[PDB]
Each structure stands twice: as structure tokens, then as C-alpha cells.
Amino acid sequence: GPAVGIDLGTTYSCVGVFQHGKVEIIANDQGNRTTPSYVAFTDTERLIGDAAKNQVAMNPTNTVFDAMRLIGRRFDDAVVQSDMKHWPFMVVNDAGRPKVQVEYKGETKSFYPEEVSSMVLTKMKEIAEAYLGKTVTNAVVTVPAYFNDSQRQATKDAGTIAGLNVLRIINEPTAAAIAYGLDKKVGAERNVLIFDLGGGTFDVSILTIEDGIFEVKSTAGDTHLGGEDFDNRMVNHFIAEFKRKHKKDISENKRAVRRLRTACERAKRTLSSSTQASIEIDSLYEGIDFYTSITRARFEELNADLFRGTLDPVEKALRDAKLDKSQIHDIVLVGGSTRIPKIQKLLQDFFNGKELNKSINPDEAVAYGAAVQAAILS
Ligand SMILES: Nc1ncnc2c1ncn2[C@@H]1O[C@H](COP(=O)(O)OP(=O)(O)OP(=O)(O)O)[C@@H](O)[C@H]1O
Ligand SMILES: [Cl-]
Ligand SMILES: [Cl-]
Ligand SMILES: [K+]
Ligand SMILES: [K+]
Ligand SMILES: [K+]
Ligand SMILES: [Mg+2]
């Protein structure tokens, strides 16, 4: 190709390419190494990635996200029915199949989950092409380890629709292990634990690797736990603060809440490197500027229960894998949320000081491994 590795996530997507014995995680037009998994439809255009997310506040009904939560599923699915209740966009039934319904250029249109994902995949393909200066065709696409045949098929289809020849569909935890070279033959089998805390989901996977062959020993987690939940906690904290300081409730102003949310997410990232962060929003509500700050300690307390809760799925995974903590040879951090110091502390303490594999940007690890695997399969 070269062939590329693509990681489609609920909040962000990432693409990498293995060249000259080195994986390059490709930055997009905005210089971002991961692209928001958003698609938007307006009176005049279809927006994808950064352009789409950067307007979600003003176009909630026609800005689609979470397509992978529907991909390969039936409309009658309990999870699909549950999820629909929280989405600002419409999901309709088409002969037992879910389709997202939106308005584009004044007309009603509907798309199968794979079509929405193909739009994001197309963006990742173009990002790779802009970088490589050559057409990208072959690719390795990743999916959560628990995805079934239908979900894998629909994910492959999204790739094909995007003009990609999907060389293989591989598990996200496996891709992460590959990124760290944990697939190399070392004689005996090894037990690896993947701790993936993304934007919308939390996955714990225990793999047993031997002779370059992976076995998913167990999987655990929470499909509704991620960085967005941490943002929500901060948002509520600041809504209350604004109310105290201005006796005005901004909760019903969907846009004001979004500008705050974005400020919070940004502040959250800053808190992973520094112990404090400043939030400055000009004319947040009724021309009132909102300048404030939050400490890492405060951020940790606001999310204490959620953070500590990540250890339960870890224990369950070990239990289902029939292994003790001591039997885990490697712990791999995946997902942007694993950059939070308190999360790393919790996991390391649980593992009695065992070092964590965290040198590869957690939100890029899956794409990294997929790129290596794509090169191998090419
Ligand atoms: N430095 C950081 N500190 C804390 N959180 C961070 C940091 N960088 C990114 N994040 C958070 O990581 C999340 C994105 O992670 P990632 O790109 O792994 O998600 P994803 O693959 O889309 O999620 P999922 O696999 O759950 O669908 C966002 O919630 C983002 O706020
Ligand atoms: Cl871009
Ligand atoms: Cl602690
Ligand atoms: K991702
Ligand atoms: K995840
Ligand atoms: K997941
Ligand atoms: Mg992910």
C-alpha cells in the first residue's frame, strides 16, 4: 500500500501507518493525532470529524455520533432501545434494522450505522492519504473483543463502503498488545491485561499469548463509563458554581452547557500534567464571563467513585480468567482517560506496584498495533 491501521472509537478515531520499522500516528488537518468520531448534516453540507464536533452544540439533531453502539445490531435490541433514549438524533426501524434519521439540504435522509462509520473511515483514509501523498486502499480495522459476527461484518462493510480493502478485523486489546511487541515468541505463554478507559466505554481484557497466537481469556468493563462521564461531573460542578456566583441556572441553555463541557474536557486533560487548570468562557450566559479554575484534587474527588469503580471489572476479569494478580505478566494502558494520574495510581496499587506499559499514547495504542499488523499482512 502501504496499508494503514484504523481505530474507530465512540469519541475519537485514530489512524497509523508502519513505515521504516516505525509506526507513524497520522495527524489530521488540524494537527490532531485523533479525530472526533462525529458526522454532521446541515442545510448545505456534510461535516466530518473536528468540523462536525465543532458545531454539535448548535446542530444536535443532525450531528451523529455513537454509530458503533448500533453497528451490526437489530432495532429490537434492548441496548439499542436503551441508547436511543439518550441520543438527540433519531433512530428509525427499517425492516428490523436501525438507521439514523437526519435532515440534509432540507430533506429527510436515513443511514445504516455502517454508512455513518464509512464516513468517519473515509476521513481517516483521507488523513492518511494527505500524509503519505499516495492512495490508501488496504487497512486493518479494530473492534472491541466482545463484538459478534454481525458487528464485525458491519464494521468490515463500513470499511468497504469507504473504499478500503479490509485486510482483517482484529480485537482492540490484541492490537494494543501488538503495539508493545507482546506478540513476539518468548518460549512460554504470557498473560496480559489490557485496561482500556476511553471516551464512552471501559474495557478490561485478559489475553494469553503463546507462539504469537492470542486467546481472549476474559473480558469485563462498562459500556457506559468513560471520559465523558468525568466531563459530566465537572460540568455539574461548574453549573452549581455559576448559579451560586450569579444566581442564574444555565442548565436549560443547551449551548451554554456545551461551551462549558468543552472547557471542562480541555481542563481535564490539563489536570493530567498539572495540578490546576483555568477555565475562561467569555459570555457563557447572558453576556456573563465565567473565569474560574479547578484543582486536580477537586477533579479527583468529583470522580472518586467512578475512578475507584474501575477496579471491580479488573477483579472480575481475573476471576473469570482463573488467574491471580501475580499471574499477569504485563498491564497495558489504553484509552485517553488512562492518562489520569489517579487512575494509574489505583491500578498500580491494585497490582502492588507493578509497572504499567504506558509509553505509547493510550488513545493511539490500538491504531499503533493495527498499523503494525496491517504492514505484516501486506
Ligand atoms: N490527557 C488526558 N487526560 C485525561 N483524559 C484525556 C486525556 N487525553 C484524552 N483524554 C480523554 O480520553 C477520551 C478519548 O479517549 P480515546 O481516544 O481512547 O477514546 P475512544 O477510543 O473514542 O473511546 P471508546 O473506545 O470508549 O469508544 C476523551 O474522553 C478524552 O477527554
Ligand atoms: Cl481533518
Ligand atoms: Cl488512591
Ligand atoms: K478510538
Ligand atoms: K474503551
Ligand atoms: K468498548
Ligand atoms: Mg477506544
- Spatial contact of 12 and 34, defined as CB atoms under 8 Å apart: yes
Q: How far apart are CA 173 and CA 325, in angstroms?
A: 18
Instruction: Report the C-alpha gap between 158 and 115 in whole angstroms.
Output: 6
226-309 belongs to CATH 3.90.640.10: yes
Distance CA 194, CA 203 (A): 8
Q: Which atom of ligand 1 is nearest to the CA of 200?
A: 26
Question: Could you tell which of 202, 234, 363 is best to mutate to test the pocket of ligand 1, judged by most ligand atoms within 8 Å of the CB?
Answer: 363
Q: DSSP letters of 90-111?
A: EEEEETTEEEEEEEETTEEEEE
DSSP string, 247-289: S---TT-HHHHHHHHHHHHHHHHHTTTSSEEEEEEEEEETTEE
Å resolution of this model?
1.7
Method: X-ray
Superfamily of domain 1-64+120-184+358-378: ATPase, nucleotide binding domain (3.30.420.40)
* β-bridge mates for residue 171, sequence order: 143
Residue 196 Cα to ligand 1 middle (Å):
10
Name the closest-CA residue to atom 28, ligand 1: 199
β-pairing verdict for 4-8 and 12-19: antiparallel
What's the CA-to-centroid distance between 47 and ligand 7, angstroms? 22
Strands 190-197 and 330-334: parallel
Same fold, 1-64+120-184+358-378 and 226-309: no
H-type alpha helices, the chain: 50-53, 78-84, 113-132, 149-161, 172-179, 227-246, 254-270, 296-309, 311-321, 341-350, 365-377
Task: Give the three-class secondary structure for 18.
Answer: strand
- List beta partners, residue 333: 195
Nearest atom (ligand 1) to Cα of 196: 25
What does CATH list as the number for 185-225+310-357? 3.30.420.40
Lining residues, ligand 1, CB within 6 Å: 9-12, 34, 198-201, 226-228, 265, 268-269, 272, 335-337, 339-340, 363
Whether domain 65-119 has CATH 3.10.150.10: no
Q: In the β-sheet with 213-222, what is the strand arrangement from edge to edge? A: 213-222, 202-210, 190-197, 330-334
Centre of ligand 1 from the C-alpha of residue 364, in Å: 10
C-alpha cell at 131: 500524509
Q: Which residues, 6 or more positions from 346, have their beta carbon under 8 angstroms from its beta carbon?
A: 307, 308, 310, 311
Helices and strands (H, E) in the chain, number of each type: 11, 18
Q: Distance from the CA of 226 to the center of ligand 4, in angstroms?
A: 12
User: Could you tell me which of 241, 233, 302, 308 has the C-alpha nearest to residue 265?
Assistant: 233
DSSP state of 76: T
**In the chain, where the domains are located:** 1-64+120-184+358-378, 65-119, 185-225+310-357, 226-309
Alpha carbon of 6 to ligand 7 centroid (Å): 11
